[PDB]
Write a protein that binds this DNA or RNA. Structure first.
Ligand SMILES: [K+]
Ligand SMILES: [K+]
Ligand SMILES: [K+]
Ligand SMILES: [Mg+2]
Ligand SMILES: [Mg+2]
Ligand SMILES: [Mg+2]
Ligand SMILES: [Mg+2]
Ligand SMILES: [Mg+2]
Ligand SMILES: [Mg+2]
Ligand SMILES: [Mg+2]
Ligand SMILES: [Mg+2]
Ligand SMILES: [Mg+2]
Ligand SMILES: [Mg+2]
Ligand SMILES: [Mg+2]
Ligand SMILES: [Zn+2]
Lengths: 117, 66, 177, 136, 94
RNA sequence: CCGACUUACCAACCCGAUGCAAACUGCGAAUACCGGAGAAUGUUAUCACGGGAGACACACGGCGGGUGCUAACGUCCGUC
RNA sequence: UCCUCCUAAAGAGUAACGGAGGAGCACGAAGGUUGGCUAAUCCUGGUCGGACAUCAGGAGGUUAGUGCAAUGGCAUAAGCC
RNA sequence: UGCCUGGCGGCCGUAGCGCGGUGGUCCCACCUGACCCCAUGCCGAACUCAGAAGUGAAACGCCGUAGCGCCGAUGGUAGUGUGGGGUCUCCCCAUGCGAGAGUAGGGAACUGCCAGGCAU
């Protein structure tokens, strides 16, 4: 298999479970150069909030976009925008990455920013 | 590398009697004295040993001459 | 690793000019080297599997993975899960170091060595070769060997065909017959 | 004599023989013998008709037997009562429906092919008719 | 060359078609091209004699249909399972 | 040693054509059954509880079948 | 006495001394959960090594597996670690 | 507002295979290094981390192409509910329903939300 399909295999079971629970989910996506976050409505088909290192507003603050420091930035940034829309509680969907390193730095940054998960 | 499990692995010098001198890593502490190396090994010259087996008439003419 | 720089500075550029590849990424690369001892007699005495594992460790410099029977075969009285062999896979620096040792000192010690067969390719640029006895590697102390034992070498490459794979190895003066 | 070399099961329900045949068309030879009646052909009847036509053509040409007797028929011995399980397998049959091509032939004159099939039909219980390979 | 006379069918389905074949007719369909399929009925004995000639399937036929004429090729035929009779024919416009 | 020729024969896999299956299905009805809405018709024709039972040897005919010999005014099921 | 398939007529049920097979257990892991993984078979190249062991690559795509019959399930795996 | 790229979905082969072409400013992939956070029944292959010199070779998007897969009429046929009939193992008639296979043909998917680059 390619790495993309293998990751999607890993991601599937959690995503299906969250759909059956009907939770609003925070979806991370990771790349060697960048990291992304989206908050998606319970239908799964519309995005309530997004944050990414491709945004100049965030990239301008950073030495480099592909490291744990950049991930912590988007974790604070996404949580602020979400609370500005009142989306206080979410479920974390790790999208088949390990809950480690950059993804953990993002998630636990969003918790300290006051998002309940 | 899992730190505990692997054997000692170390740089050693090697010396061939052809005068070739070399450095390698190895699992041993000895300096590697060598009888042959890929430089001096005769493979690129020695094949002639078998071709000498093909001749026949250049043997008999010795008896025929004598 | 020494031979790695030789690849970067000579092999890649000459291969570029030889096949006229358009991108440096298209040039073949060595991915891994794998050593295998099919011990077999581990069905009798487990110390033999251990002793064979110690030899691969000395040759390769890393602990071998013992390989279990994929399925039971009455033809050899093996049940599934029995140890049958051990393997080592070499990558990166220690791959190039072993590769250098093999060419420069090991294969010269083969008895009546005339060079390796140039046709021992699987059809997709991977080269595999056997050795009859462990003594070709100086790390094995001749004074202490218990039994004769050989092993298989396999070299895996990104080459697409045997002509490309053969060109890659020959560029190292890999001693083909 | 025709039988399956092996079968998944030994005994079979009687079933029914409704419908019309598939395989209504000559497909290998030029001439053939078509079933018009309905019934069973036993392996013995198929073989007897086969021997009759090959003798007529003196083995010249080629013959295709299109039917195969794959259905086992059981019977009970004499002087036994009802019950006590299903009888033993005795012979094999093919179920024939109207329209099935039973035999094909080529490599001989039509006027000889008709004679050969006339001799064969006399062995078969069902009524049959001579047919020829159509264009389309 | 072969020329055929046909009539458009007024009723279709199982019962209607069997009544045709009892009356020495048989149904046929013309399709292909751009126009919708055109359903017609044919005189059996005439067409039965024509289709006995190998040219009937290779050559282009023409069917006169209630004042029109159409050029077609025989695409498929359903024969009766054991009688020398035709059940149905497909013609494709050509 | 390796191995060549030839065949009075057989010949798996794969490919093209042709059939068969209660215990095969990449297809698939008519009916029947479950639920909902509506009109008319029907002596509530429905359900619950209580008093009294009798019956638990069935037969033939049609349709769908197992068994038998697509034998039986045979035998065992489904439905009328 | 119990389980699976057909008979059984596309809801359920449905007999015969009708046609075919199993059970009278096993497992403190073979249970729970978290993380990861993906088969048979065949063809190439390789010490002993052979039609069949371990190794590398390819084709294939579940034709494998399921503690024990058969049926229905299973890739989000219910299979393997 | 147009073009391209990424993510999350609708849908679940007209949407998938094969063959040919094509893309690197962004994005994506490959990629560079590994003492460290982490990992290998052995191995930075995978997972993870720190990066940005190359390359679009592979992969992945996009475009073309009916060698396949797939979709698919009309008409006919098979079967069948109700009523009737026969030469009654199986058929026919009136009426209602009506396949499967095959044929003509279609077909190289379409689409919602958010974000980024380029053009306006
Ligand atoms: K009562
Ligand atoms: K049933
Ligand atoms: K397509
Ligand atoms: Mg009717
Ligand atoms: Mg009683
Ligand atoms: Mg009685
Ligand atoms: Mg009784
Ligand atoms: Mg009764
Ligand atoms: Mg009776
Ligand atoms: Mg009966
Ligand atoms: Mg039922
Ligand atoms: Mg029913
Ligand atoms: Mg799991
Ligand atoms: Mg199963
Ligand atoms: Zn030397």
């Amino acid at each position: 298999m390619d790495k993309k399909s293998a990751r999607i295999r890993r991601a599937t079971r959690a995503r299906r479970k969250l759909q059956e629970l009907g939770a609003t989910r925070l979806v991370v996506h990771r790349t060697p150069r960048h990291i992304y976050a989206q908050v998606i409505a319970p239908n799964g088909s519309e995005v309530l909030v997004a944050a990414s290192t491709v945004e100049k507003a965030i990239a301008e603050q950073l030495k480099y976009t592909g490291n744990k420091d950049a991930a912590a930035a988007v974790g604070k940034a996404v949580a602020e925008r979400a609370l500005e829309k009142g989306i206080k509680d979410v479920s974390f969907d790790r999208s088949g990455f390990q809950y480690h390193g950059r993804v953990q730095a993002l998630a636990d940054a969003a918790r300290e920013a006051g998002l309940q998960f | 590398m899992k730190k505990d499990i692997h054997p000692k692995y170390e740089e050693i010098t090697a010396s061939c009697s052809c005068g070739n001198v070399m450095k390698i890593r190895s699992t041993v502490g000895h300096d590697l004295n060598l009888d042959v190396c890929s430089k001096c090994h005769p493979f690129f010259t020695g094949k002639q040993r078998d071709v000498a087996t093909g001749g026949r008439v250049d043997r008999f003419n010795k008896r025929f001459n004598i | 690793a020494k031979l790695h720089d030789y690849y970067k500075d000579e092999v890649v550029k000459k291969l570029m000019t030889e096949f006229n590849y358009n991108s440096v990424m298209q040039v073949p690369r060595v991915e891994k080297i794998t050593l295998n001892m099919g011990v077999g007699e581990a069905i009798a005495d487990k110390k033999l599997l251990d002793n064979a594992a110690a030899d691969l460790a000395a040759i390769s410099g890393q602990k071998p993975l013992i390989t279990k029977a994929r399925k039971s075969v009455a033809g050899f009285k093996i049940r599934q899960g029995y140890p049958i062999g051990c393997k080592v896979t070499l990558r990166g620096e220690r791959m190039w170091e072993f590769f250098e040792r093999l060419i420069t000192i090991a294969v010269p010690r083969i008895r009546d060595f005339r060079g390796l067969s140039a046709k021992s390719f699987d059809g997709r640029g991977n080269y595999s070769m056997g050795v009859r006895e462990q003594i070709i590697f100086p790390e094995i102390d001749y004074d202490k060997v218990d039994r004769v034992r050989g092993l298989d070498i396999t070299i895996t490459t990104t080459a697409k065909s045997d002509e490309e794979g053969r060109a890659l190895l020959a560029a190292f003066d890999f001693p083909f017959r | 004599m025709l039988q399956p070399k092996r079968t998944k099961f030994r005994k079979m329900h009687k079933g029914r023989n409704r419908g019309l045949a598939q395989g209504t068309d000559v497909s290998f030879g030029s001439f053939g013998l078509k079933a018009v009646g309905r019934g069973r052909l036993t392996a013995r009847q198929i073989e007897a008709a086969r021997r009759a036509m090959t003798r007529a053509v003196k083995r010249q040409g080629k013959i295709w037997i299109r039917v195969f007797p794959d259905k086992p028929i059981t019977e009970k011995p004499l002087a036994v009562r009802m019950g006590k399980g299903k009888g033993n397998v005795e012979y094999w049959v093919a179920l024939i429906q109207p329209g099935k091509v039973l035999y094909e032939m080529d490599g001989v004159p039509e006027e000889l092919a008709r004679e050969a099939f006339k001799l064969a039909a006399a062995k078969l219980p069902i009524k049959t008719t001579f047919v020829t390979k159509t264009v389309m | 060359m072969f020329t055929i006379n046909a009539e458009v069918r007024k009723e279709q389905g199982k019962g209607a078609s069997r009544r045709l074949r009892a009356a020495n007719k048989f149904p046929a369909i013309i399709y292909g091209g751009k126009e919708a399929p055109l359903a017609i009925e044919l005189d059996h004995d005439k067409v039965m004699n024509m289709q006995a000639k190998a040219e009937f399937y290779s050559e282009v036929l023409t069917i006169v249909v209630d004042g029109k004429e159409i050029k077609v090729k025989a695409q498929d035929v359903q024969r009766h399972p054991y009688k020398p009779k035709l059940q149905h024919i497909d013609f494709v416009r050509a």
